[PDB]
Amino acid sequence: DKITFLLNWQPTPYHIPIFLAQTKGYFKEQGLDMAILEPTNPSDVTELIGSGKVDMGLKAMIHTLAAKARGFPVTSVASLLDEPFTGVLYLKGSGITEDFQSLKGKKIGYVGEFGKIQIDELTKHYGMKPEDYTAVRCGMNVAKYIIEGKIDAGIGIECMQQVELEEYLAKQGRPASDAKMLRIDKLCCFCTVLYICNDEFLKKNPEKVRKFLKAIKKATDYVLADPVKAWSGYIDFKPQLNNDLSYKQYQRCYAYFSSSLYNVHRDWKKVTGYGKRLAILPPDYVSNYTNEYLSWPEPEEVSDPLEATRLMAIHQEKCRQEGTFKRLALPAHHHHH
Amino acid sequence: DKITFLLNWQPTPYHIPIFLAQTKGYFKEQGLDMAILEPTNPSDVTELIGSGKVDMGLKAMIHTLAAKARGFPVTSVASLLDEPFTGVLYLKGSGITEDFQSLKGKKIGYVGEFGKIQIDELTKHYGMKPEDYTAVRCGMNVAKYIIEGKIDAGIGIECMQQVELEEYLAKQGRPASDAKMLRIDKLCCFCTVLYICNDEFLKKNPEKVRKFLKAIKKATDYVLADPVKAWSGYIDFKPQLNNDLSYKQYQRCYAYFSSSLYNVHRDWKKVTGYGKRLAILPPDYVSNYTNEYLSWPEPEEGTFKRL
Ligand SMILES: *Cc1c(COP(=O)(O)O)cnc(C)c1O
């Protein structure tokens, strides 16, 4: 009667709400016995949860969509990390540039399956063809392989892998700005990180899932309210995260955490479209999420998505150079009709 | 159709055979798709495997025995780390001494469950009573809490936690000998680390288990034969183990690796007796191992050297 929860990755700073929910006893106060597990290989994750072998866990939006398409019955019941900047990371001097064509003849790292597909597909739109480049499967070590020169560039998230590149550059006395990204968010939200359930587990235990999300919500509020105290609680439990890199990653992630846990209807509509178009998704495919098990009201709708993206970009820079914890203040949406 | 394999701990240097069997493709050459998982809490482990939620994994002998007793159908099919030195670790100046009585009024860390029971029980034999001491559950952080002063002593393995204390001492310029253990040869195979199977999974998949053990055996031979090459393969995959502490731990573990994977009939006989006696095991309890799935003969009853 323990409930298996499988992370999408080795412990990261953004996993803080799950671990705090455990260590602070919020799961216990809901009468839940969670067994948090960590994958050795992120690609095992959708298959294990989809097949019922694991009850719940986390995976990105693009992968959660493709999971149902490939016949793994999973449903997103909430959102953890909202729309982090994803792209092809590289160091200045790679010599890769904003010219997508500069990827020609380069070794490019992707984590598992979908990213490669993502680049296979972008080449056609830039007059390139696979293989004008060599794709290299890297699992959880994309950043590491860029730093070690085993690849020229690689796919990653701004608040995780980019921060790893920047910390390396700092050790070399090079400026942070030498860590550059070719954003895919402008070639979005594929890499939103979701709480997902096995479909039959969800059918059979809706009350437990609802209680889970309450515990998570309590921990998420704590982390947003008191990030510093939260962090020290986390790294006492998970000493592997007790370093400056993890802490910096944590600060960059702060602005991306979902405060309401709601699945964003627009984000899914966008991503389902993109995926449908890439033959990953059947033409009649329906988005596999629900907000039924969230026990609190939903917030006002997304405004100026490009505006927010631009504003977020600016915000994340201030975060890097100031070392702060600030949520992106957002002007509410004006309806002209 | 992936097979879930749950480690007994965060990745350690002694998990190297498993990871190498994966990264070197030995699991693949047997037509196995293993999903190696890591626990966040070692105590979840027997219950998850016992209940069938996870197919296979690792666990110490004392825990694997108590799992069946507590109604979790698990069976040991092979052995990984043989009889590492287990005991109460402490720093000289704690001030704890070889006198078990010195544990009086001290904070003593235990990993999760059986560790506490082991000390509750040893006190009765030393005229002490729980609680002449405070037991503190520490999970995977016993050494860390000793170093940080949050506990005075704690239960651990010589090649893992003790090495962690020693590396701390070296950072302080203190001698390694200041990391001391009260060894639980105070009545050491409880902490032998076993490959274990869910019973029903074993019933329904004996050919796969046999093939798993073959991949493991191949990796195990590689590690013993070429420990240095093996290590760099490991830490390329698992960069969290790329540090001097992990490498030192690895060298201490090397002598303890089981080279044949066989369950040792004597070790189990001893441990089953101990467990029966303190009330951890029913009087009619039968050891839950088998060497049936091993496909090779049983052998006769800063360096890398086998003993
Ligand atoms: C499960 C496990 C533990 C936890 O056991 P307790 O003594 O009950 O804390 C400790 N060490 C190892 C190696 C384990 O596998």
Contact between residue B293 and residue B210 where contact means Cβ atoms under 8 Å apart: yes
Picking from B22, B40, B240, the nearest residue to A37 by CB comes out as: B40
Measuring from atom 1 of ligand 1, which residue has the nearest CA? B42
**Interface contact B47, partner A, CB < 8 A:** yes
The amino acid occupying position A164 is E
- Concatenating the DSSP letter of every residue in A184-219 gives STT---TT-EEEEEEHHHHHH-HHHHHHHHHHHHHH
- End-to-end Cα separation, chain B, in angstroms: 40
Known catalytic residue at B265: no
Solved by what technique? Answer: X-ray
| A51 Cβ contact list (under 8 Å, min separation 6) | A72, A198, B2
Distance in angstroms (rounded) separating the CA atoms of residues A111 and A72 = 20
Which residues in chain A are immediately followed by a break of C to N over 2.5 Å? 187
- Concatenating the DSSP letter of every residue in B185-206 gives -----TT-EEEEEEHHHHHH-H
Strands across the sheet with A107-110, in order? A134-137, A107-110, A153-157, A86-91, A179-183
**Interface contact B212, partner A, CB < 8 A:** no
Question: Could you say which DSSP state residue B85 is in?
Answer: -
Residue found under tokens 């704590």: A222
Picking from A2, A38, A239, the nearest residue to B38 by CB comes out as: A38
Query: Which chain A positions have a beta carbon within 8 Å of B240's beta carbon?
Result: 10, 240
- End-to-end Cα separation, chain A, in angstroms: 52
User: Which of A73, A114, A66, A61 has the alpha carbon at shortest distance from A263?
Assistant: A61
Buried b (16+ CB within 10 A) or exposed e, B95-115: ebeeebebbeebbbbbbbebb
> Which residue of B18, B37, B41, B237 is the best one to mutate when testing the A interface, meaning the one whose CB has the most A CBs within 10 A?
B37
Active site residues of A: 63
Give the 3-state DSSP-derived string for B244-297, with helices as H, strands as E and coil as C.
Answer: HHHHHHHHHHHCCECCCCCCCHHHHHHHHHHHHHCCCCCCCCCCCECCCCCCCC
Distance in angstroms (rounded) separating the CA atoms of residues B147 and B226 = 33
Which chain B residue's Cα is nearest to A236? B141
Domains of chain A: 1-83+190-337 (3.40.190.10), 84-189 (3.40.190.10)
Distance in angstroms (rounded) separating the CA atoms of residues B196 and A103 = 47
Q: Could you give the maximum distance between any two Cα atoms of chain A, in Å?
A: 57
Which chain A residue's Cα is nearest to B18? A40
Measuring from atom 7 of ligand 1, which residue has the nearest CA? B115
Chain A segment 276-315 residues within 8 A of B by beta carbon are none
Resolution (A): 2.7
Question: Could you say which DSSP state residue B29 is in?
Answer: G
User: Which of B265, B267, B195 has the alpha carbon at shortest distance from B17?
Assistant: B195
- Percentages helix, strand, coil for chain A (3-state, rounded to 5) are 45, 15, 40
Query: Which chain A positions have a beta carbon within 8 Å of B36's beta carbon?
Result: 40-41
List B15, B63, B125, B265, catalytic entry: B63
Ligand 1 mean position to B155 CA, how many Å? Answer: 9
CA distance A40 to chain B (A): 6
Picking from A53, A54, A239, the nearest residue to B144 by CB comes out as: A239
